Each structure stands twice: as structure tokens, then as C-alpha cells.
Amino acid sequence: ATYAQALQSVPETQVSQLDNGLRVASEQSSQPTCTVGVWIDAGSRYENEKNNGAGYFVEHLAFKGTKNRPGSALEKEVESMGAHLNAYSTREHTAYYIKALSKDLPKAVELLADIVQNCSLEDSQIEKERDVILQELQENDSSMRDVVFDYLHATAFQGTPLAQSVEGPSENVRKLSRADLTEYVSQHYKAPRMVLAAAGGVEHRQLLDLAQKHFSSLSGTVPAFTPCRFTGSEIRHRDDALPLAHVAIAVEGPGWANPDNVPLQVANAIIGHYDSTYGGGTHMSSTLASVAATRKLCQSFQTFNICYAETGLLGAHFVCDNMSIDDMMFFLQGQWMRLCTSATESEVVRGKNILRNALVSHLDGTTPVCEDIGRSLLTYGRRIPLAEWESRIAEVDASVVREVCSKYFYDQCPAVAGLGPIEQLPDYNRIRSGMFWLRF
Amino acid sequence: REFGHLTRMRHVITYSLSPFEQRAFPHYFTKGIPNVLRRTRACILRVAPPFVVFYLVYTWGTQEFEKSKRKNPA
């Protein structure tokens, strides 16, 4: 077992396509469990301002009931068989995965065929879920991380569907009507933009037969998004009652395929993540982590690489007190420019190992593997094997990182989103000036 | 008196934009000129009268000095 042999000895993600365009995929390896999901290609990205938040509403209403399974009967099927049903809908993707035992894979598929195709959209249920949406949005107001990320998306992709939040404006939540939800489920849940992915012990032939016996009667064989724009700006929500000030800084990243993703993920891996409850503290190779632990100017910071199809956000988000935001911005920008101008080999090797471990450790359990399958079939158009990932990491070197960071970080107008006691946060001019180094 | 503890403010939202994306001279003449005229009209009433009083006393003083340094009573 020489690692590379293990990557070569990974079961292949077998993929087939029905006449309707359903991309069926499976990764049968050993387990008696499975995760079966249908990864839609819908989300808030494909929503007009009137329809903003319809995807969230459809996600909520999906599990309530169907015509074949009125209301709680659906739940009765999921719990009585031991299955765990779950859904998640981001800006550009939506999925309903039902974790279950591999023995009862047939029924689950049928169950899934009910949820995505034949929904209920009951009007009384619509009002009951409208109220829940409102209170849940008031809940998410408390989530500082989510609020700051939505602020970043609003200020970066302003005037574009990317700015639209997943939940939608509170006004829309009240103004959505059953006609809009029916249109959305009849316009963004079409068969071509579907990925039926199953992990665990799921034989591919059985999956194909089940899909052809349950998902056959679907749409036959246009809204295809608009290339959004990046607008260097900032949203500063100065609110001096929150104890900490969450700040998120990002630059236009790569596209979904955009092989430059592999070097950048290494570069961000060099920065790493730090918070107050970590271990080593003033010993991590990450200069930001070491400095933060030496001065306690950071409460929790991480590097994010939210990457959409035509563009993406690459940056860092940090949480700290009111008197340490400027020191943060200084050190964060300084490390960014240090990688930009002189990246050297050793930290590149560390980033390569870090990225290898991230990709390898993420792909365990039926749910993460199935999520990888469904997302890969939509974004990259193929399930990128871990061997290919290793090959793409291998040739990344110091020069490659120094050039990709130069092409993405050096002298680029950023997007900033601060919330809380963010008065100490430097104005946009100083932040923009941080992205160029007179010493260079 | 440094950034961080000047005062307390809440529920304020400030949007801005990178200087490299928005125009440096937005409507410099389309909106600049009417604004200049409005600002001029706002303060001309309270600025001019003291100076026109100066101009009046100046012209009167110079002409009276010229008149005094002359020949009449002899």
C-alpha cells in the first residue's frame, strides 16, 4: 500500500444517462448503507427578483407531502425504514438525499421519485410554511457568519442574481403564491438538470433499473443563467452591540473547472484556519495562526473558496474584537502578498499535503461521497477521480502558486463585508492599497 | 483618540465602491454647475453687501482725496 496504489484502487464512479437526461451515478464499494439523492441544478442563481426565495420554499415544502404520500405518510415511510431524509439548497444547487440501508434501496428511489416530481404544494401548508420561513429568517439574522457571507455576496455581485440570498427577501416570503412555486418546480426541476447519485452499496445496474422504473415519466429530452460581474465594494454594518466583529474579504476567484482552482486551494491551505480553541497555538506553520495565537488578536478565522460556475469568491473571513481588525487586515494582506511575491517551496509542500488530506478525508461515508458525485456531475461535468486530484496537486510548485496568486491577488479590487463593531476596519482605500506592495 | 473607540453607532449601513471601477469625474459639468450656482445664491446675499460697502467707500475716498488735493477763494 503505497498511497498512490490506494488512490488507484478506488472503485470507479459509474455513470449512465437515461433518455430523459437523468445522469445516474453510483460508487458501490462495500457498505450495507447508502445515500441516494437527486442533485437539482436549481437555486437562487436562477431566480428573478420576484421569485427570489422560491427555491427555499420548494425545499421546505418538498418533504411535507405528495399526492401518492399525503402528508405525514411520507415521514412515516422515512422513519419506519430507518432512513434519514435531508435536503440542502445553495445558490446554484439543490439536493434531497435520503440516507438509508442498502437493502431497501428500491423503496427509497421510489420515495425520491415522489418528492422531486410529484409534490403537493398545499395552500394551507404553504401558509404554515410561510410563517416558518419568516421565523427561520429571523433566526438566521443571529447567525453572524451567514449574515456576513450574504453581505459579501450582495456587495460583490451587486446587480446580478448571485447577490440574491438563498432565503430571499422577507417581503417575497409573504408575496410568494402557489402559482410561482408550481412554475418554479415545473421550470427548474426539469430532467436534463438532474443528477441521481447514490453511494454505499448500490449496484449500478439496479440503480439504473430503478431510475428507469420510477423517474421515467419526467420532462422530455431558455433559463441558463447570465454571466455575473464582480464589483469591488464593501458593506459595513456598524453595530456596536455585537461582542465581536465578523469581517469577510474576497476577490474574484476561478470558475468551477478552471484548473487554477488546484493551485489556489493549495495557497489558501498555506494560510489555514485558526480559532481560540485550537491546540499548538504559537507553533502552527501558518504565520497568521502563529501571530494570532501570540497576540490573541483573532477569535476565529478561515480561508474560503466559494466558487461558482462563471466566477467565484476567494478570500478569508475572520472574527475578532473591536480593537484588532486593523492588525488582522494588515497581517492577512501581508501574508497574501508574501505568497504572491515569494511563495518558496516548503510551504507549498505543506499546502500540497494539506489539500491531499482535505480531499481524501472529506470523501468518507456515503453522504459525503454521494455529495461529491452529485456536485461533480453538475459542476465539472464528470466525477474527478482522486487519482486525477493527486496528479493535479503533484505538479503544483512554488512558481505556479506565485503566478496564480499574482494573477488573482496582486492589485485586485476586493469585496469587503463587515458586521458588528467594525469601526476599526480600514476604509476601502487602505484595503485596496494593501493589495499592492511598494517593496515589490 | 484613535480608531476603535471614538463613539457608538448602530443600525447604520454604508455601501461604497472601488475607486478603480467608478468614474473619477461623474457629471462634473452636468451637475457641478447647477450646484455651484445654488451654493453661490445661498451665500451671495450675506457675502456681497460688506464688500460693496467697501467698494463704495473706496471710490468715494479716492475721488474725495483727488478733489481735496486741488485748487479752489484766492
Automatic annotation (TrEMBL), chain A:
Membrane protein topology class: Peripheral membrane protein
Keyword vocabulary terms for this entry: Acetylation, Electron transport, Membrane, Mitochondrion, Mitochondrion inner membrane, Phosphoprotein, Respiratory chain, Transit peptide, Transport
Domain Peptidase M16 N-terminal: 23-169
GO terms of molecular function: metal ion binding
Organism superkingdom: Eukaryota
Pfam family, one: Peptidase_M16_C
SUPFAM superfamilies in UniProt: LuxS/MPP-like metallohydrolase
Chain ranges of the Peptidase M16 C-terminal domain: 175-355
Subunit structure: Component of the ubiquinol-cytochrome c oxidoreductase (cytochrome b-c1 complex, complex III, CIII), a multisubunit enzyme composed of 11 subunits. The complex is composed of 3 respiratory subunits cytochrome b, cytochrome c1 and Rieske protein UQCRFS1, 2 core protein subunits UQCRC1/QCR1 and UQCRC2/QCR2, and 6 low-molecular weight protein subunits UQCRH/QCR6, UQCRB/QCR7, UQCRQ/QCR8, UQCR10/QCR9, UQCR11/QCR10 and subunit 9, the cleavage product of Rieske protein UQCRFS1.
Family: Belongs to the peptidase M16 family. UQCRC1/QCR1 subfamily.
The protein, known as: Cytochrome b-c1 complex subunit 1, mitochondrial
Lineage of source species: Eukaryota, Metazoa, Chordata, Craniata, Vertebrata
Gene: UQCRC1
UniProtKB/TrEMBL annotation, chain B:
Membrane topology: Single-pass membrane protein
Keywords for this protein: Electron transport, Membrane, Mitochondrion, Mitochondrion inner membrane, Respiratory chain, Transmembrane, Transmembrane helix, Transport
Protein location: Mitochondrion inner membrane
GO annotation, cellular component aspect: mitochondrial inner membrane; respiratory chain complex III
Superkingdom, natural source: Eukaryota
GO biological process, one term: midbrain development
Segments traversing the membrane: 43-61
Quaternary structure, from the entry: Component of the ubiquinol-cytochrome c oxidoreductase (cytochrome b-c1 complex, complex III, CIII), a multisubunit enzyme composed of 11 subunits. The complex is composed of 3 respiratory subunits cytochrome b, cytochrome c1 and Rieske protein UQCRFS1, 2 core protein subunits UQCRC1/QCR1 and UQCRC2/QCR2, and 6 low-molecular weight protein subunits UQCRH/QCR6, UQCRB/QCR7, UQCRQ/QCR8, UQCR10/QCR9, UQCR11/QCR10 and subunit 9, the cleavage product of Rieske protein UQCRFS1.
Cited function: Component of the ubiquinol-cytochrome c oxidoreductase, a multisubunit transmembrane complex that is part of the mitochondrial electron transport chain which drives oxidative phosphorylation. The complex plays an important role in the uptake of multiple carbon sources present in different host niches.
PANTHER family: CYTOCHROME B-C1 COMPLEX SUBUNIT 8, UBIQUINOL-CYTOCHROME C REDUCTASE COMPLEX UBIQUINONE-BINDING PROTEIN QP-C
Entry's family note: Belongs to the UQCRQ/QCR8 family.
Entry protein name: Cytochrome b-c1 complex subunit 8
Organism: Sus scrofa (Pig)
Source species taxonomy: Eukaryota, Metazoa, Chordata, Craniata, Vertebrata
Gene that this polypeptide is encoded by: UQCRQ
